[PDB]
Amino acid sequence: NLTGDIVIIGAGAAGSLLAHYLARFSNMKIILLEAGHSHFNDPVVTDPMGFFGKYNPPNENISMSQNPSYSWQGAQEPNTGAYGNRPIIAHGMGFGGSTMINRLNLVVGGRTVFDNDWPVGWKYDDVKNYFRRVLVDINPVRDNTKASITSVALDALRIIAEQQIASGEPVDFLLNKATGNVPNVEKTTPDAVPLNLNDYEGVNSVVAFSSFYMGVNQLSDGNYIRKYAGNTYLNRNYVDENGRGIGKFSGLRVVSDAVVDRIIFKGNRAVGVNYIDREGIMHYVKVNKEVVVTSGAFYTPTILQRSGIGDFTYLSSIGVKNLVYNNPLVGTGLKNHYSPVTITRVHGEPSEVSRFLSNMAANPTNMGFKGLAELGFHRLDPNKPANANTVTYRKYQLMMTAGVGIPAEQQYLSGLSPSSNNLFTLIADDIRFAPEGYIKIGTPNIPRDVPKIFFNTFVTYTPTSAPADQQWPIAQKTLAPLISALLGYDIIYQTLMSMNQTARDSGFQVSLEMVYPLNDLIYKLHNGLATYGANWWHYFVPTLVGDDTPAGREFADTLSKLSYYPRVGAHLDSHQGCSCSIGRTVDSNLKVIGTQNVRVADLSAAAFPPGGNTWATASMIGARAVDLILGFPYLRDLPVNDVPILNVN
Amino acid sequence: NLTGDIVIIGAGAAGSLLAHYLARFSNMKIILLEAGHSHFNDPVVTDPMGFFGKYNPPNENISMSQNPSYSWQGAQEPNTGAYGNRPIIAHGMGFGGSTMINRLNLVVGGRTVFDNDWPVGWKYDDVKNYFRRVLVDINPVRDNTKASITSVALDALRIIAEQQIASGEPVDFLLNKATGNVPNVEKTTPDAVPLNLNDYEGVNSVVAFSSFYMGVNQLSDGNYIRKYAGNTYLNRNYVDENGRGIGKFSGLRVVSDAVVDRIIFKGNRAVGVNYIDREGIMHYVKVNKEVVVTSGAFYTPTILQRSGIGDFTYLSSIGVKNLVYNNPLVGTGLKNHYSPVTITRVHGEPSEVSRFLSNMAANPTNMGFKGLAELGFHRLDPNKPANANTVTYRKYQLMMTAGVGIPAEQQYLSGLSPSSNNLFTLIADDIRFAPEGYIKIGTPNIPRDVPKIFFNTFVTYTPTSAPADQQWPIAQKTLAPLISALLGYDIIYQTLMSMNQTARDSGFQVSLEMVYPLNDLIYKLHNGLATYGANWWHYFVPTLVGDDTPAGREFADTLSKLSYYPRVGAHLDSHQGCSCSIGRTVDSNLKVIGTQNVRVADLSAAAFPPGGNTWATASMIGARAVDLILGFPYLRDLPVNDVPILNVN
Ligand SMILES: Cc1cc2nc3c(=O)[nH]c(=O)nc-3n(C[C@H](O)[C@H](O)[C@H](O)COP(=O)(O)OP(=O)(O)OC[C@H]3O[C@@H](n4cnc5c(N)ncnc54)[C@H](O)[C@@H]3O)c2cc1C
Ligand SMILES: Cc1cc2nc3c(=O)[nH]c(=O)nc-3n(C[C@H](O)[C@H](O)[C@H](O)COP(=O)(O)OP(=O)(O)OC[C@H]3O[C@@H](n4cnc5c(N)ncnc54)[C@H](O)[C@@H]3O)c2cc1C
């Protein structure tokens, strides 16, 4: 059988990177266990456009994140904040985990969230060199096609940014503390310099730009290949077809189609690991030094819980025999991001409209994204952190795509066809998403697609009999996600209306109408914000206001009608994390509290969600785990011209 | 490790009965492997009101079919016929399988379906004695509470059956051949005799009645207990706390929390089974004679496929190492039933509406069902079997319950609140549901909650360039589920229109109006049927009808709008079966075609779905399996006064 010093469970964004550099920088035997196998020869994965269904059979037309051959199908419990819906969120199953199946938008997350929401030792300056390593190993690219709509939008954001600065207000969504009075929006002059949202020093917290950075590389023939954690760190230059490491990496052994069951303990020391191989026969792996769990946000706590680490009372109740350490926090504090969708219609001469919307087609260097920004809090969000006026937090990720991004049922109901040549999509993604959830295993036997995953989003506040003033502080906290989602709509509404101006100024005979959610409803909202000011959101709870005006019943009704849209007209991001966070399940050194030699090194260990997509943070965490395990800053101090060399096969 | 003569996988509706009676009638070593455990001491299962959430924690308020601790979570692939939805369909996990978590409505299925849709040897007279055994072992009870609305609905149906008989027409939904000219509707006079839909000879194919039959028994203290496969056949009188048989049953061995991975073969002969226990350790069980799979419609074909039985090219493509027999049909032909919901509002004085709607509350003896019938084809359904006029087929199971049975998102859009005191639910369940789907494993390693389950329902027909005449027979077959669902609405509409009469005749000063779907639409539908006749469903494809009149575009429009309602205003049943049906994956003696000694004895073997709920048919199959294996009609001939004895613990 196999015996190792370090056993790593899960070859995701964290596991791949962790295994790679541990083998390089030590002479220990590194054993990496993965539930799936490599997909280096699969065009659905290695062609970036595979994400959009280029290679889908027309009879089984499903994305990788809908496909059990490519992923874990994590079906959550009924969402009490979304009509009982049960969304299915995926973890990639294969070399590289979810980076094997994601949309490849690589985003650091910015300085502020690490300086403020992570503990000492995990502040932005403690992690920035590792983020730099994660980026240069991928070496991501920018959009190869400039679209007129991008510049018109950027020019629209600039005008708004100037108004917000000129007004002198303390907090608003285009303000950026590190750039002062100069609107931090990329210019549209002919040879303008790009603004980099991943800038090394974290200056660009709030920033508007023309391009994200995509995880693809160009091959000699001009085609693009997916550049993910899988083929960057486990390609054939480093790991052969039998899974044995090569050369300086020969201590590494990578087991494919190996589904891990439990960590076996002696006292509070892990000494072995279970897994079922591709034939369905169970094997034992002996452990000499450490076990590192990197199985993703949904499934890392399930491994710990199946292993005897969690709420003893609960774990006993479903039949876990061998209990190890009692910590009720295992699996709690699950966070995510959330993207409510908006649709816009372009009016005007068909030829002028076709011109205005040109160059937006998805290709590998943009994956569909034509902008736009990382934005801050709306001035009227009552739930800002205390120091939001002295440091600039990230709140919204503003993305613009072509086409109609609402689900098919919403397309039917709204009358908005994906084949109209005059519609496009704006999304204000909440990346400081208030809701919190938890994960519990339902059975002790085997790893399952579906543990109990509780995650309630846009819940309602039920009024009590107490005086109103005693209720508002509780309601403000409960309604926190509805409030942020609706204000994101107002941000897009503002943007669209300046675009009406900057589009004419750029010579386009067009005008724009927000059509999803209803233009009529959004207008009323915008007006409501100006009429009722800081406390507009009280009308989510109409009975406690006692405004018996025709105008008051009407705004309360508008908020009611609008509360529908973030519930069904949205796409839950697949950015789940924090379910075993630092200070709750593991300590500052990623060691699982209560054990001698178990660590967690994936996104489940994260103290707080990064301000943006989550791939970069995941690989960053595994990267720091490399130096923590070796006891020297090998990875932090590695020069930036030293990268893994890509082998496509 | 263990050794047995017959190894049974899954203690479901079939597994429990098969294990019980095999132990009794033979001296063989019978080993029953079950993934879950007994819930004899869990009030959520053994108290029938637990199904409705009596013991649910208020913060995790979820039914058993939503709970991984009680069930497998079968999330299906996106439904191309329902806006991409992914409903999650459960199999119970524990002693009694799905009978442990279901709504307990015990229905045989009627004679016609077995006489016409099952193979030689499985005709009604071949199976009726086994059905009789299944019923007397449970001994279901009828509703303990007569409600006025039931009698009002029945008297309305009587009037409708009489019009249908009088008209001399060959096929309609209240006609029943075996009872001729006497309307087969239970009488509502004071001391009327009940109609039994499960009558032994199968006379009542189409029949209206006041009560279904529930799987509960009354205890001496007046409380009701759930009477399911688990505690009927595997309670402490028969199997001790260690899973070992008692007395005459000592050959039986029941292993709990045993998740089976594969069946091991030597040649085309099974010699073993592997399983994972609750500690996460794999065991091997030796097989001397036979292996019987009774793991449910979703998971029976997955065990075979993981074992090397199925489409070889595909099983290779996902990494199954050991192939055994090539049968591309394994897992194909999956069927289900489907229940679109209708909501009715009662108008009148609040006190008189309240009286009309009294006594409809769910209690253990009715589980909410207050009627009503098994109905036949609507006369304007073009997809009847050839002999639909010489034998009476079951097509709709018409059920009436209290409250508002549409999903929460639909309650909001329609304004139909579950707390309005004046709404009730009528359901015409398509129990000859046209759609056919299939199951394939996504990975070779382990049993999973979520294999690929493709099941597309209310798909659209896309017109080709061919002449209309060549397309209609295709369009007729494609649109079959939409056609039947809509006609189900009309059946309810007709009933409601007569109930307006019969409510006055019974002294209720109320009026009834169908409000979900919109009354206007159903009205327009009813007129459309009389106007365009047999070829009304052509207007699903308006461009092929070339009717550009206002009356024509309007009817085409009415149908487009109604197609929305069965897709989202409904509940997919958990009556899945036929995925390893007789004549395709197994032969008439339940043996897996291609093996020496493997059988399938659960609902996945079913040739065609029973005309009604599926528990009974499932146990019926397990029952013949007892006789088929032992080679004698032991069970067919056992006297009906010899029943299993109930032990509550
Ligand atoms: C559809 C989709 C779109 C996304 N879009 C983007 C994007 O555009 N940009 C971005 O920055 N991020 C995106 N992500 C998120 C990003 O990819 C993840 O956050 C990142 O992979 C998380 O890193 P991780 O190591 O913690 O998790 P994972 O990458 O998911 O690592 C999990 C690995 O562990 C394995 N594993 C799990 N359980 C077991 C077990 N019991 N035994 C053995 N192995 C196991 C899994 O097979 C998997 O390989 C998206 C993800 C998805 C699924
Ligand atoms: C929510 C719900 C409501 C329903 N309501 C009704 C109703 O009102 N009336 C009605 O007649 N029917 C209803 N049923 C459906 C009916 O109960 C099923 O069709 C019937 O029980 C089928 O039984 P079965 O033998 O085919 O398999 P099942 O009853 O489903 O049992 C299969 C068993 O095999 C086990 N198993 C699966 N895989 C493995 C493995 N790898 N290793 C070990 N064990 C395994 C499962 O745990 C399960 O215990 C309902 C079902 C559900 C879930």
Structural domain boundaries, residue A467: 143-212+337-432+456-573
User: Are A492 and A615 members of one domain?
Assistant: no
CB within 8 Å: B451 and A280: no
Contacts of residue B169, Cβ cutoff 8 Å, sequence gap at least 6: B175, B379
The length of chain B is 649
* Test the B interface: residue of A445, A448, A565, A572 with most B CBs within 10 Å: A445
Is the CB of A18 within 6 Å of ligand 1?
Answer: no
Q: Where among B554, B573, B592 does a domain terminate? A: B573
Amino acid (1-letter code) at residue A628: L
User: Are A519 and A647 members of one domain?
Assistant: no
Tokens at A608, concatenated = 């707080």
Nearest to A68 among B69, B407, B452 (CB): B452
Is the CB of A107 within 6 Å of ligand 1?
Answer: yes
How far from the centroid of its chain's Cα atoms is residue A327's Cα?
A: 27
Q: How far is B350 from chain A (nearest CA, A)?
A: 26
CB within 8 Å: B452 and A93: no
Q: Where among B541, B573, B605 does a domain terminate? A: B573
CA of A614 to the centre of ligand 1 (A): 9
Q: Which residue of A has its CA nearest to B448?
A: A448
Q: Residue B11's closest CA among B237, B239, B214, B215?
A: B239
Give, as one character, the DSSP assignment of residue B50: G
**Ramachandran assignment for B613, one of left (phi > 0), alpha (psi -120 to 50 degrees), beta (any other):** beta
Q: How far is A431 from chain B (nearest CA, A)?
A: 26
B296 is in an annotated binding site: no
Is the CB of A336 within 6 Å of ligand 1?
Answer: no
Secondary element (H or E) of residue A430: strand A423-430
Tokens at A22, concatenated = 């541990």
Q: Are B296 and B575 in contact (CB under 8 A)?
A: no
User: Are B96 and B75 members of one domain?
Assistant: yes
Nearest to A321 among B279, B321, B441 (CB): B279
Tokens at A571, concatenated = 């796409």
Give, as one character, the DSSP assignment of residue A541: S
B522 is in an annotated binding site: no
User: Are A131 and A14 members of one domain?
Assistant: yes
Per the listing, tokens 């550099």 go with: A21
**Helices and strands per DSSP (H, E), number in chain B:** 17, 25
Residues having CB closer than 6 A to ligand 2 are B 9-15, 33-36, 65, 90-93, 97-99, 101-107, 258-260, 294-296, 299, 303, 447, 574-575, 602-603, 613-615, 618
Alpha-carbon dihedral angle through residues A127, A130, A134, A140, given to the nearest 10 degrees: 70
User: Are B51 and B169 members of one domain?
Assistant: no
**Ramachandran assignment for A605, one of left (phi > 0), alpha (psi -120 to 50 degrees), beta (any other):** alpha
User: Are B504 and B547 members of one domain?
Assistant: yes
Q: What is the CA radius of gyration of chain B?
A: 25
User: Are B97 and B234 members of one domain?
Assistant: yes
Active site residues of B: 575
Residue whose CA is at the smallest distance from ligand 1 atom 2? A102
b vs e for B417-432, b when ≥16 Cβ sit within 10 Å of the residue's Cβ? eeeeebbbbbbbbbbb
Q: Which residue of B has its CA nearest to A87?
A: B86
DSSP B508-569: ---EEEEEES-HHHHHHHHHHHHHHGGGGGGGGSGGGTT--SHHHHHHHHHHHHHTHHHHHS
Is the CB of A32 within 6 Å of ligand 1?
Answer: no
**Helices and strands per DSSP (H, E), number in chain A:** 17, 23
A9 is in an annotated binding site: yes
Pocket test for ligand 2, best of B44, B88, B102, B621 (most atoms within 8 A of CB): B102
Beta bridge pairs of residue B282: B276
Query: In 10 A of CB B473, how many CB atoms?
Result: 10
Distance CA A354, CA A362 (A): 16
Q: How far is A154 from chain B (nearest CA, A)?
A: 35
Q: Which CATH number is A239's domain given?
A: 3.50.50.60
b vs e for B517-539, b when ≥16 Cβ sit within 10 Å of the residue's Cβ? beeebbebbeebbeebeeebbbb
Amino acid (1-letter code) at residue A507: G
Q: Cα–Cα distances in Å, from B597 out to A123, B265, B293, B590? A: 64, 10, 11, 10
DSSP B101-112: TS--B-----HH
Tokens at B408, concatenated = 């929460």
User: Are A111 and A171 members of one domain?
Assistant: no
Distance CA A394, CA A113 (A): 8
Q: How far is A16 from chain B (nearest CA, A)?
A: 21
Distance CA B140, CA B138 (A): 6
CA of B292 to the centre of ligand 2 (A): 16
How would you class B513 by CB atoms within 10 Å of its CB: exposed for 0-12, middle for 13-18, buried for 19 or more?
A: middle
Chain B environment of A88 (Cβ under 8 Å): 75, 86
How would you class B310 by CB atoms within 10 Å of its CB: exposed for 0-12, middle for 13-18, buried for 19 or more?
A: buried
CB within 8 Å: A445 and B262: no
Method: X-ray
Distance CA A581, CA A300 (A): 11
CA of A122 to the centre of ligand 1 (A): 22
Pocket test for ligand 2, best of B295, B443, B600 (most atoms within 8 A of CB): B295
Amino acid (1-letter code) at residue B466: A
A362 is in an annotated binding site: no
Q: What separation, in Å, do the N-terminal and C-terminal C-alpha atoms of chain B show?
A: 28
User: Are B479 and B380 members of one domain?
Assistant: yes
Q: Residue A330's closest CA among A353, A350, A303?
A: A303
Is the CB of A259 within 6 Å of ligand 1?
Answer: yes
User: Are A259 and A357 members of one domain?
Assistant: no
Nearest to B75 among A75, A407, A447 (CB): A75
**Number of domains into which chain A is organized:** 2
Q: Which ligand has the minimum distance to the alpha carbon of residue A99? A: 1
Per the listing, tokens 């967690």 go with: A600
Tokens at B617, concatenated = 């048919």
B503 is in an annotated binding site: no
Chain A environment of B277 (Cβ under 8 Å): 445
Contacts of residue B645, Cβ cutoff 8 Å, sequence gap at least 6: B237
Q: Are A383 and A480 in contact (CB under 8 A)?
A: yes
Nearest to B69 among A37, A407, A443 (CB): A443
Tokens at A507, concatenated = 């010579």
Q: Are A376 and A176 in contact (CB under 8 A)?
A: yes
A485 is in an annotated binding site: no
CA of B92 to the centre of ligand 2 (A): 5
Q: Where among B524, B557, B573 does a domain terminate? A: B573
* Test the A interface: residue of B443, B457, B459, B571 with most A CBs within 10 Å: B443
Q: Residue A436's closest CA among A590, A297, A642?
A: A297
Tokens at B332, concatenated = 């194909």
Alpha-carbon dihedral angle through residues B593, B277, B225, B17, given to the nearest 10 degrees: 30
DSSP A347-405: EE-HHHHHHHTTT----TTTTT---EEEE---TT-S---TTTTTS----EEEEEEES--
User: Are A114 and A240 members of one domain?
Assistant: yes
User: Are B557 and B416 members of one domain?
Assistant: yes
Amino acid (1-letter code) at residue B355: R
Give, as one character, the DSSP assignment of residue B592: B
CB within 8 Å: B443 and A36: yes
Distance CA A355, CA A367 (A): 21
* Test the B interface: residue of A281, A446, A453, A455 with most B CBs within 10 Å: A446
Pocket test for ligand 1, best of A448, A575, A585, A621 (most atoms within 8 A of CB): A575
b vs e for A84-123, b when ≥16 Cβ sit within 10 Å of the residue's Cβ? ebbbbbbbbbbbbbbbbbbbbbbbbbbbbbbebbbeeebe
Contacts of residue A47, Cβ cutoff 8 Å, sequence gap at least 6: A54, A55, A223, A225, A226
Distance CA A434, CA A378 (A): 15
Tokens at B141, concatenated = 């009870």
